Chains A and B, each alone.
Chain A
Amino acid sequence: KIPAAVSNWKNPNGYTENNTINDGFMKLSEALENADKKARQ
């Protein structure tokens, strides 16, 4: 059985992401926050 074609681009006259964060992102911001606190002290 073929479904009916309904287009997002054109209308006939008649009958009108899963993936989570990579851990390299987690570990980059931990390192940059330690270097920030260590530098400001």
Chain B
Amino acid sequence: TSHRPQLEARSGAKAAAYTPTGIEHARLLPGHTTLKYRKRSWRKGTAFGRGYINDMTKSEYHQEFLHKHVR
């Protein structure tokens, strides 16, 4: 039971600085500094001769999956 997150401001009112301690992070280094503005005897011999659904697991894509990777 987490039951509540941490409100940000209890970090933000801490008196290290307005800034952090003075740690310089690599992702906070400068970059992208310029903003961009928009302007027949053999045949007779035998006996038997002559949708998109909204569910993952009941789909056609899923049963072709389980037919290939469970062999």
A touching B, CB within 8 angstroms: no
- Chain B contacts to A: CB under 8 angstroms: none
- Chain A contacts to B: CB under 8 angstroms: none
